[PDB]
Amino acid sequence: DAVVVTGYQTVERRKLTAAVGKLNISDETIGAVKSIDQALAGQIAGLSVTSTSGAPGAPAKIRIRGTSSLNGTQDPLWVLDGIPLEGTDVPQSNVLNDVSNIQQSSIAGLNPADIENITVLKDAAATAIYGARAANGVIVITTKKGKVGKPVINFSSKFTYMPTLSTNRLNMLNSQEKVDLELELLRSNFAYGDNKGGVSKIISGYGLTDAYKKGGWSALTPEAQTDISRLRNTETDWGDILFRDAFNQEYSLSLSGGNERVTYYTSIGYYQENGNVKGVGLDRLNIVAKTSYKVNRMLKFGVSLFVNRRNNKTYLTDTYGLVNPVYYSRKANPYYQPFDANGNYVYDFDVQNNSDTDLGFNIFEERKNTSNEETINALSSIFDAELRFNDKLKFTTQLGLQLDKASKEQIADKESFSMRIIRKNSKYWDSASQSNKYFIPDGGVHKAYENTNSQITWKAMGEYRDSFNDIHELEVMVGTELRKTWYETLFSAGYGFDRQTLTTKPVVFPDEDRARQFPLHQKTYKENAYVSFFSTASYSLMNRYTFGGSIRFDGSDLFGVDKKYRYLPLYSVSGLWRLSNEPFMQGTRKWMDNLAFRVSYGIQGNIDKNTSPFLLGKYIVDNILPGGSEHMIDINSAPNKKLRWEKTQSVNVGLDFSVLNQALNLSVDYYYRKGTDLIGKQMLPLETGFVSTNINWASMVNKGVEVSLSTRNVATKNFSWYTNLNFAYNNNKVLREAIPEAQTIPGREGYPVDAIFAIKTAGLDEEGYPLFYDKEGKKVTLKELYRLQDPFGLGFTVNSDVTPAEERSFYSYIGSQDTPYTGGLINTFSYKNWELTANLSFNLGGYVRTTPSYNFINFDRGQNVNSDILDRWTPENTDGRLPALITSEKRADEYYWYDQKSEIYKNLDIWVKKLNYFRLQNLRLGYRLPEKMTKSLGMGSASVAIEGRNLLVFGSSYKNFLDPESMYNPYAPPIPKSITFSLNLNF
């Protein structure tokens, strides 16, 4: 095509001075995806897409030209038909189980069957018209519209088979070796969770714990021996209990058309999708209704409506995911049967990570007495008006209204582990009677969440296009925009809830502190208003030189009221030079189609919406003089009157090349983006009233190169295949950042935001303890490394003189979690009526810190473990590579230093693993039915297809994990593989 859309105005391709990526959304390019953010993986150079989960409806983490802020909006801006979208941010959490409670983005409500193109604005010259929202990139969505002609009626039906999640890559211990490990641990001096397990409960029941410890297998009675041998031979398929294969459905019906005066588009879609975890699913039903009327030869008015309804059903777990079925697959004992021989429930009391055995868990009882249900109702309406004053002047105004209401309902009955843990957490000590009680009433809990995100944006633009002397072209646009946003949440909880009777019971909280541990009713409200003034200019000379510029003035209620910073521009200047259209190079025009150089410079902005320019305080009733008490306000946050956006000074140099009738196009872009005035915590001088505050001080640099190559390898009458290679390398570095004085892991200054620091180990010593390195390079134990001193000799009284600034030097940089090298290869073959698309996407160069296979101090023998526990050092296996299970009996100072500094073992270099994976994102084979058969059935066209999604992943090994990007979070299901059959009809 010869047009680029930016969400504000349309640019000719020959005048585009910016770095812009483009993707055409269709079945042949985009596979049978259901969200338009999951379809972007490997198809735009410089746009990195990562999966948050494999669960249905889970958002994606998209980074355009890296990370641009430390504490702020790191997600791109999504623009739907010129109106920016709200609710597309992906909140980050430190609790790994929060991934099971993620909120869907508004992007999940948009059918890709309605989107025509996706244009990604990468450069400062492409994004600086968005001002304070430009630093993270902008992804603008163009929706399909009716074409002038007879109505076009497209029906599409897709049927997906999702194979079951096979937990064979988890490398769990089977019943035989699990029982062997439990017997081996019961014979040793390792005393943690000694009461936990199945062997230690069988043996303790008959009372031969001491007899077994002294004697062993021989000292065990035949009855206990038969019980243990029966345990060894009990095998339970937990993957079959927890996971299943699914059949998913998708249907779409679209009807387009147009007059000489009216163009219309309508669409209805409905999909039902199931997750690999039993009991989860998500259905989406949506309607699209677009229409455009030519009221006059000057006035044109259009109305576009997108209504959407998504219903999600899933499980609720604990705050820390001891119930989580995905994590329970790695946790359930191989010999534990969920059901009795008489069909009753058998409870798992080893779910808790501590030594407590009091609350029992059953997955069949959890899936019956527990429910998580959400419903998202979304509306998005755009009214467009256009008035052509001249053949040069044109005024276009636009109003976008957006509403998104999510209603969640979590119910836990009385007989469920969620309610058991909730009741247990309510334990309190009452002085009236010396005892421990529980203030949460006996029954269930019903929790109700209602989150509403509303937005109204209004844009007005005036564009003027002129040509002088046939060699000068000028385009000037001036606009204004007002945008207001609301976010309102309400949460309500009721304890004592009977599911069938819908009643509730009162709760008597001992304090006001426990009344917030179990909130009963809370409300949150947020408003924001934004006022912006635009201008874009472009001047083209001799159809060969183009100079463009952008200026934007942004004001908001999230910025300070200081006149020094209030209205500062967010500009851009860019220039294109077409070397091909040059009279000295007209000789190389029979084989060269295009040569062009783009150079852009600009200033981009970012808004941190979690910081305020206001004096946020709290009321305290204190007194200065005796007898006189009054309300006083204590300052919680300082009034930053100079609060502003975060600057990003960026440059971009790009090359566009095209030779042999587009037989081979190349597009290179080297960029350097230096972000300053980043908002983060700074240690302020004491001459202001505060020790630290969040202000605009920090810095970051993202510097790299993107390459897009597009080849037409063969073009024959029958066979023809094309290749698309997208590649991008990005280098992220934090330049200025404040590190707390009491932090022992080093800061990211000079390293990516996703830096991973690990304590490099010299192996294991003769006793199986990890061995370290000192500054001289000598293999040094933890006692020598930390200079541990025990003057009392009691073991737990150990201390170290090593300061945090010196513990910071024990860590060495390994790599970044965010993969530097990203991209994809898309091959498209066509042969007569057959079409074969192979989409492959690579993420190379990353590192991931995986949770240790087992803890050497706190190892819980009541839960299943990897086969890595079989590679540990033992007196019988002295050549084991992984650290041994240590006890306080030997080396008490080292044991009790490892115990309190629990992050030394978690930050060892042996748990950090490479991240270089290629994924077959899509493999599609299509067949267009011959025109004779379509005419026979009265069909304008017909097509079938078979698609394979995530069918193959290779690269660096991901051992003990189900997916290369499931290596960080064990609480999120991996990306499912799918085989889908599609039938498309054109009436």
Binding site: A529, G555, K618, H631, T688, I695
Partner: protein
């Protein structure tokens, strides 16, 4: 279709009313540092205890061990001074943004903020700055002046002359803005009309401007002059906030720890004559070495920044 970008947060308390700004200023009044007693620890009127856990805190202050103090020695609260100064400056900068209050109430709030700023700069420059009357000290950099609410600025030390010029300017600003002649006894820490004159008299006494010191002392003495007659009441302390002598009961000069950890040396007590009501009212009964604990402070009821007894001596000296 929406503008008027001025929506404030609805999650916290953002002071806008005159009542909320008075609450903020009251919180500022609460945190006025008790560093004048810690400074007087370096004078001849206090003697730290001979036991440990009290020598480690105040001994190095007592012995003027500036160069190599004990790691655990009690520190001067530089941070609290500038926290109270920040709140005073916020109240000053909000003059026209204070709503739901009469002009007189807002004017007195701003005048109290001005006088608090002047008083804090005065005590800070007398703690960490060379004396004004000292030769060669008017051009010595003593302390930074906190005259705004800026957070992204590093303040440099001002000369003593600049600091005192700022103090006098703020006293003049407060003179035309404080309009409360008398406050309630419970609220007496807040600055009254006579507080401006008392502070002006003290500032001029410290500067050496005897005519202005006498003028201010006489101006305040024309309205409040009644002393505490301790020959009638041999146990009444003028330091008490309930006293008729008090003008501003703001600063509790001696903290609980500082009062509990110091005696009164017999050398200082030798300055009292045979017949003196202060000799018995101020301090307790003697001890093995003649050292007396002081009952003139250590609890919040003995709060006093200005009072008539000091102004009598100011006028006498001027």
């Amino acid at each position: 279709c929406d503008s008027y970008l001025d929506i404030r947060p609805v999650g916290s308390v953002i002071p806008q009313t005159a009542e909320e700004y008075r609450a903020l200023l009251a919180r500022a009044y609460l945190n006025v540092p008790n560093d004048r007693g810690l400074a007087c620890l370096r004078s001849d009127e206090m003697l730290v205890n001979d036991n440990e856990y009290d020598r480690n805190s105040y001994g190095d202050i007592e012995r003027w061990n500036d160069v190599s103090p004990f790691p655990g020695t009690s520190q001067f609260t530089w941070s609290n001074f500038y926290n109270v100064l920040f709140i005073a400056n916020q109240v000053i900068e909000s003059q026209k943004e204070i709503t739901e209050g009469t002009p007189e109430v807002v004017n007195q709030l701003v005048g109290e903020a001005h006088l608090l700023r002047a008083y804090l700069h005065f005590v800070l420059v007398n703690l960490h700055g060379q004396p004004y009357t000292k030769s060669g000290a008017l051009n010595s950099k003593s302390i930074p002046l906190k005259l705004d609410t800026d957070l992204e600025k590093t303040l440099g030390r001002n000369t003593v002359e600049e600091v005192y010029t700022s103090i006098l300017s703020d006293i003049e600003h407060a003179r035309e803005l404080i309009n409360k002649e008398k406050w309630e006894t419970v609220f007496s820490y807040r600055f009254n009309v006579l507080s401006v004159d008392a502070l002006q008299s003290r500032v001029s006494l410290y500067m050496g401007a005897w005519p202005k010191c006498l003028e201010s002392a006489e101006a305040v003495l024309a309205k409040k002059s009644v002393l505490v007659d301790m020959n009638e009441t041999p146990l009444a302390l003028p330091n008490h906030f309930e006293s008729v002598e008090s003008i501003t009961a703001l600063e509790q000069v001696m903290g609980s720890s500082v009062n509990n950890a110091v005696w009164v040396p017999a050398t200082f007590l030798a300055l009292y004559q045979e017949g003196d009501k202060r000799l018995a009212a101020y301090f307790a009964a003697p001890d093995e070495n003649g050292n007396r604990k002081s009952s003139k402070g250590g609890k919040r009821e003995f709060s006093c920044t200005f009072r008539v007894g000091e102004l009598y001596l100011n006028a006498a000296e001027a």
